[PDB]
């Protein structure tokens, strides 16, 4: 029924967009090589380019936010919504919080259907069904324990229970997050109009569903939408705070700017809603996806958004829908999550290379700049480290910190609550543990296995140490070579005397800024 949207003429938008991407890449590369072949002014130029990109993104985000806030329209509670949740080994506390949040959603009960799928049918997963039965005791609740999946009878019972009852709980054999999502989507059928997806560690605000329905009911062109998912445990560790700041920056700058042009690249898994008809149209193709990083099968929320964009339906984003989701506090769990995210992004980049002619040019621009940024950053860092002077390394570090400080100041301006100044410490995490993680994710696209287990039997998987060790060894060798060369250089001349004083003052300022940031973080985490 939903027609596959397509622009009026191909070979006329596709060619122009591909040529624009190639021209942009060639121009950026040419400027980079020109700077490389013919120290302060080059880094300054890079800083101004990043600053201009930030101003463009922030202006578009502000315009979108003002448009959303100004525009309003009363909602007619006539569209059915189905919340689908998946649980592998979730902690009882997070699961109970999610269940209560779903139950207390400020939506009519005759237009809301809750379905939960448990990834496991053994005796160690019956507790999730027990809590589900305890929570929705007074409603039309139906529970089943399947002995298999859709790709292993019970199919008729599962479909009947899902389509004929409000609250449904189904166990199934272990098949990963893809299997539970596929089972829920297949059992949905055509019962509802909107399908909202949610993880079993996400607490939902009461007005999130209402606002998402409002933004999806304004125009028929929209096919998917996402919300502003936040962190419910931002004080568990230092990395949790950084994850919260990064989440807020993402969902309030990048998502808003993409929604201004209706090209939201990714819809958050914990908070996302899709049109039922389109979802049922592309479900089978979504499950049967491969040829990404060799021939390994894939499928996730990012692939769902990519399919929605491929069919021609634009994806929106509203800031009035709020949710809280937990994030890893351990360093290695966070690294594994980042590697999995980067693997998914790299796999989806090839699939989303096409479909660019359907939704604007900002998608292509953002995709190409995000693809080329880490490589150029790594090349610049390697060149400046291998230059062989303490001077160059010192201003390299100083420029990396000044750019981060300016970004954090602008973030404080647009946010308005001043806690955002702590984001300036994200450089020490991006340039030491995130770039090697990205390289590892690029080098091992053919592998899989999620990486992080459920929150019952927390486990190890200390694999990311190898990229970290390699990066640390490379950096240490570079700094050692530079310090050796500069110590074996000439001195006692006025130029070198002034250089020594300037670098001493720069180091003093750097350490003062570092201790100021540390004191501010300590005071804000203690008081």
């Amino acid at each position: 029924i939903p027609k596959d949207l397509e622009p009026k003429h191909p070979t006329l938008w596709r060619i122009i967009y591909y040529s624009f991407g190639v021209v942009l890449l060639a121009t950026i590369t040419a400027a980079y090589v020109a700077e490389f072949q013919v120290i302060l002014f080059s880094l300054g130029l890079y800083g101004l380019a990043m600053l201009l990109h930030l101003m463009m993104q922030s202006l578009f985000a502000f315009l979108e936010i003002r448009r959303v806030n100004k525009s309003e329209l009363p909602c007619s509670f006539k569209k059915t919504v189905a919340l689908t949740i998946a649980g592998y080994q979730e902690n009882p506390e997070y699961l109970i919080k999610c269940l209560e949040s779903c139950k207390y959603v400020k939506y009519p009960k005759d237009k809301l259907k809750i379905i939960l799928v448990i990834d496991g049918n053994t005796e160690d997963d019956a507790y999730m069904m027990e809590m589900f039965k305890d929570v929705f005791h007074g409603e039309d609740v139906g529970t089943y324990v399947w002995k298999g999946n859709y790709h292993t009878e019970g199919i008729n019972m599962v479909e009947e229970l899902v389509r004929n009852k409000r609250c449904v709980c189904i166990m199934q054999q272990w098949g990963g997050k893809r299997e539970v999502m596929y089972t829920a989507f297949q059992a949905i059928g055509t019962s509802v109009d909107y399908v909202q997806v949610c993880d079993s560690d996400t607490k939902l605000d009461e007005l999130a569903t209402v606002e998402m329905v409002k933004v999806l009911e304004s125009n028929d062109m929209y096919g998917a939408v996402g919300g502003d998912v936040r962190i419910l445990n931002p004080y568990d560790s230092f990395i949790s705070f950084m994850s919260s700041l990064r989440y807020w920056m993402a969902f309030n700058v990048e998502r808003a700017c993409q929604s201004y042009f209706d090209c939201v690249s990714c819809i958050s898994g914990p908070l996302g809603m899709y049109r039922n008809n389109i979802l049922q149209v592309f479900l089978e193709a979504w499950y049967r996806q491969k040829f990404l990083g060799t021939y390994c099968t894939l499928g996730d929320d990012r692939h769902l958004t990519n399919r929605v964009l491929s069919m021609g339906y634009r994806t929106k984003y509203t800031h009035k829908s709020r949710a809280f989701s937990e994030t890893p506090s351990l360093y290695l769990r966070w690294l594994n999550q980042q590697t999995r995210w980067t693997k998914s992004y790299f796999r989806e980049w090839l699939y989303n290379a096409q479909w660019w002619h359907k939704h604007h040019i900002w998608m292509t621009y953002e995709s190409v700049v995000s693809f080329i940024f880490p490589f150029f950053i790594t090349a610049t860092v390697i060149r400046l480290i291998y230059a062989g002077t303490i001077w160059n390394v010192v201003w390299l570090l100083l420029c990396i910190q000044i750019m981060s400080l300016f970004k954090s100041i602008y973030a404080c301006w647009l946010r308005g609550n001043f806690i955002m100044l702590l984001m300036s410490l994200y450089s020490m995490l991006y340039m030491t543990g995130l770039l090697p993680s990205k390289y590892f994710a690029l080098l091992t696209l053919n592998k899989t296995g999620w990486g992080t287990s459920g929150r019952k039997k927390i486990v190890g998987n200390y694999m990311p140490i190898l990229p970290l060790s390699i990066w640390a060894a490379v950096l240490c060798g570079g700094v050692g070579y530079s310090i050796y060369m500069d110590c074996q250089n000439d001195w006692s001349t006025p130029e070198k005397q002034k250089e020594m004083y300037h670098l001493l003052y720069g180091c003093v300022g750097y350490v003062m800024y570092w201790v100021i940031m540390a004191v501010m973080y300590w005071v804000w985490v203690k008081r």
Partner: antibody, heavy 124, light 106 residues
């Protein structure tokens, strides 16, 4: 527990008067399910009258019921309530109180756990 | 809006297959249910959603859908299966019931 529905309020009423019917529910919650009223005239078949859903405000009536009868519910009392005004001779039947789930798409679930019947006699 | 139970009367012996079909003006977004009512007794649900069967009833009763036609079939007519069968179309703001189709012994 066991789901039960009891209808009360039937009797003889002069034409043009007002009548009250109550449907008491046990074993479940009124707000979690739909409640419908079905008429069965003597010698005729089942005829729908009105329906309501608590905690949502949804209300429905038949063409010949609109403007005359009203249906409400009491979650605290767990009782459906039907007030009928401007009664006529054709209104005599055996009223039934039924329970059901929700409508969703093309799947309903039907009227399960039917209640008993109550007699209404509208004559002079 | 308009519902028509075609037979309106049927006379079959014990063990004979019984087929009762119902015609609806529109069934795009409305479910069809089949109930059984005995003389003087409240009706009991037999088939819901026009394909599924209620729990606890004998497996003999079967429901089928073809276009705008909805069919209820009984394989073996038990001596306790003689009653009046009602075909109902359920939808928001409009519910319509059937009539007739009383199976009687011959």
């Amino acid at each position: 527990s066991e789901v039960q529905l009891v209808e009360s309020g039937g009797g003889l009423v002069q034409p043009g008067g007002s009548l009250r019917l109550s449907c008491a529910a046990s074993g479940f919650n009124v707000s979690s399910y739909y409640i419908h009223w079905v008429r069965q005239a003597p010698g005729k078949g089942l005829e729908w009258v009105a329906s309501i859903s608590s905690s949502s405000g949804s209300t429905s009536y038949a063409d010949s019921v609109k403007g005359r009868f009203t249906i409400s519910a009491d979650t605290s009392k767990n009782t459906a309530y039907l007030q009928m005004n401007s009664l006529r001779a054709e209104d005599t039947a055996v009223y039934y109180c039924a329970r059901s789930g929700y409508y969703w798409g093309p799947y309903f679930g039907g009227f399960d756990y039917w209640g008993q019947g109550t007699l209404v006699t509208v004559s002079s | 809006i308009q519902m028509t139970q075609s037979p309106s009367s049927l006379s079959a012996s014990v063990g004979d297959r019984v087929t009762i079909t119902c015609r609806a003006s529109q069934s795009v977004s409305s479910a069809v249910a089949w109930y059984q009512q005995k003389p003087g007794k409240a009706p009991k649900l037999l088939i819901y959603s026009a394909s599924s069967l209620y729990s606890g009833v004998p497996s003999r009763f079967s429901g089928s859908r073809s276009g705008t036609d909805f069919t209820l079939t009984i394989s073996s007519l038990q001596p306790e299966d003689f009653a009046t069968y009602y075909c109902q179309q359920s939808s928001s703001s409009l519910i319509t019931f059937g009539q007739g189709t009383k199976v009687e012994i011959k």
